Each structure stands twice: as structure tokens, then as C-alpha cells.
From a paper:
Bromodomains (BRDs) are protein interaction modules that specifically recognize ε-N-lysine acetylation motifs, a key event in the reading process of epigenetic marks. The 61 BRDs in the human genome cluster into eight families based on structure/sequence similarity. The four helices form a deep cavity that is extended by the two loop regions (ZA and BC loops), creating a largely hydrophobic Kac binding pocket.
Recently, it was demonstrated that murine BRDT preferentially recognized diacetylated motifs, whereas most monoacetylated peptides tested did not bind tightly to mBRDT BRDs (Morinière et al., 2009). Recently, it was demonstrated that BRDT requires two Kac residues for high-affinity binding (Morinière et al., 2009). Our SPOT array and ITC data showed that multiple Kac sites are generally required for specific recognition of the histone H4 tail by all human BET family members. For the first BRDs of the BET family, a spacer of two glycine residues was optimal.
Author numbering: 20, 27 to 57, 60 to 135
The structure:
């Protein structure tokens, strides 16, 4: 179709941009007038931006590709266990477009 640089771009640029986006709150913990069904929709995804942020702070990833797998896990779980029209899905989709744009610009 260098490891420190990749991981540093993922932390300081990619994650930063998602973290600060206005739709990232369903993908963060804690969740801060939310209805209870919607609270469950958010928290039933076992991957979130917090987990990725901590792994990046604590040198958890041996490869940048392992970081990308966590991101995939997060988006994938959203799409799998919610319906295509759902708010959480459309929000995940906008974050995912931002993620893929920024990933595309990562130095190679």
C-alpha cells in the first residue's frame, strides 16, 4: 500500500487534538444533564482516551503500532455496540476523521 518520535507525535499532536475536540467527552473518563441510558452507552466501551494517554505517559507501548491498535479498539467498540445513526457514533466518526488526517501527516 524514531520510535520515540512516532510516539511523541501520537501524544503531543494526535491525542492532543482529539483530547481538545468538542466531541471527545464520551471517550474520556470521568463523564462530566446526561441521561442514564446515555451514560451506560459511554461507559460500556472499555477503551477510552484516558487509557491511551496514560500508556503514552508511562512508556507502555513498545511500538507505535500498538498505540494505533488501542485507538482502533476504541472506535471499533463504539461502532460495534451502537447503531449507525446514534449520537455517540457520529461523534466517534468525526473524531476518527480527525485522527486519520493527523496520522496521515505524521513524519515517515
Amino acid at each position: 500500500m524514531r520510535l520515540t518520535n512516532q510516539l511523541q507525535y501520537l501524544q503531543k499532536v494526535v491525542l492532543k487534538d482529539l483530547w481538545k475536540h468538542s466531541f471527545s467527552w464520551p471517550f474520556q473518563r470521568p463523564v462530566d444533564k446526561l441521561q442514564l441510558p446515555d451514560y451506560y452507552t459511554i461507559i460500556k466501551n472499555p477503551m477510552d482516551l484516558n487509557t491511551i494517554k496514560k500508556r503514552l505517559e508511562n512508556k507502555y507501548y513498545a511500538k507505535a503500532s500498538e498505540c494505533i491498535e488501542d485507538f482502533n479498539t476504541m472506535f471499533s467498540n463504539c461502532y460495534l455496540y451502537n447503531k449507525p445513526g446514534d449520537d455517540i457514533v457520529l461523534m466517534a466518526q468525526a473524531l476518527e476523521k480527525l485522527f486519520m488526517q493527523k496520522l496521515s501527516q505524521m513524519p515517515q
